[PDB]
Design a protein around this ligand. Structure first.
Ligand SMILES: CC[C@@H]1[C@H](F)C(=O)N[C@@H]1COc1nccc2cc(C(N)=O)c(OC)cc12
Length: 291
């Protein structure tokens, strides 16, 4: 990886211009642990993520995720993984530019982009599953699978991002002692919330992403019934509603059999008991057969 000086990263991002792209600024996105800026360097467009405490998190904790991202990215290069180009040590990571942003942005139709077709959503789901299969074959657990961590290039190819929490070893990691767990709780499996590290947790989180794809709704919304998206599984199983009641209205090309087929996959991924979920290879097979 290339070691960029901090000052030249400041230059190429128009002095880290935090105005949106619309008004001629460089801000592309924001999360709990940083802001992502569009940059121009070496006759190319790049993305620069500058780490910062936007939510409650310490400097030492951010430095750990910075070092972990670089260690994992050095071992993991794949069609369905975002490519790290370099770094600078504030702490900056530099990536290949993804012009179609995150899956979350595109499902919300941010900045008046047109809705994703059913067929495009199926191909993105397949791409993301192939990304997770690479990681699991190479004995990695992502630990932060969500629509904001699925990026889209010129061809709408799915690229998994954010490897700051990724681990190379399985753990039970539960005692009567107080502990600190990091993650996005709206996407997290029961055993993941309690602190267990297993690839079976990545399957559950993928299940939540499949529901976002079907419904076009965010994983959590305070001003909604239900607030958690994964709760609709019970609503449908109790025959109180159907999947048809939750399908994204903005889709016109979603045949019932194909949508029913994807919900069944999502339902299996969202089993409370981790041993009762399909493995990633079974998820790949099922997605391929219905598309
Ligand atoms: C701090 C924000 C977090 C974190 F960055 C992440 O992995 N997911 C979140 C959203 O991030 C992004 N949102 C919109 C657009 C984004 C374009 C790029 C890009 N390479 O062009 C990007 O690269 C990494 C991240 C982008």
């Amino acid at each position: 990886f290339h070691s960029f000086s901090f000052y030249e990263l400041k230059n190429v991002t128009n002095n880290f211009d935090e105005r949106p792209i619309s008004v001629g600024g460089n801000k592309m996105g924001e999360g709990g642990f940083g802001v992502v800026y569009k940059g121009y360097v070496n006759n190319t467009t790049v993305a620069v993520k500058k780490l910062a405490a936007m939510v409650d998190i310490t400097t030492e904790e951010l430095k750990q995720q910075f070092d972990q991202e670089i260690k994992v990215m050095a071992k993991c290069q794949h069609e369905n993984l975002v490519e790290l180009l370099g770094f600078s040590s504030d702490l900056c990571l530099v990536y290949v530019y993804m012009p179609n942003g995150s899956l979350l942005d595109r499902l919300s139709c941010l900045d008046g982009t047109p809705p994703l077709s059913w067929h495009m959503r199926c191909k993105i789901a397949q791409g993301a599953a192939n990304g997770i299969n690479f990681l699991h074959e190479n004995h990695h657990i992502h630990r932060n699978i969500k629509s904001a961590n699925i990026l889209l290039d010129e061809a709408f190819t799915a690229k998994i991002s954010d490897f700051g929490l990724a681990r190379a070893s399985e753990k039970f990691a539960q005692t009567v002692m107080t502990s600190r767990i990091v993650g996005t709780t709206a996407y997290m499996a029961p055993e993941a919330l309690r602190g267990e590290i297993t690839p079976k947790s990545d399957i559950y989180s993928f299940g939540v992403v499949l529901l976002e794809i079907i419904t076009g709704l965010p994983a959590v919304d305070e001003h909604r019934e239900p607030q958690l998206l994964l709760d609709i599984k019970e609503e449908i199983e109790d025959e109180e509603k159907t999947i048809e009641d939750y399908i994204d209205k903005k889709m016109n090309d979603a045949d019932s059999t194909s949508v029913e087929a994807m919900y069944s996959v999502a339902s299996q991924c969202l089993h409370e008991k981790k041993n009762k979920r399909p493995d990633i290879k079974k998820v790949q097979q099922l997605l391929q057969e219905m598309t």
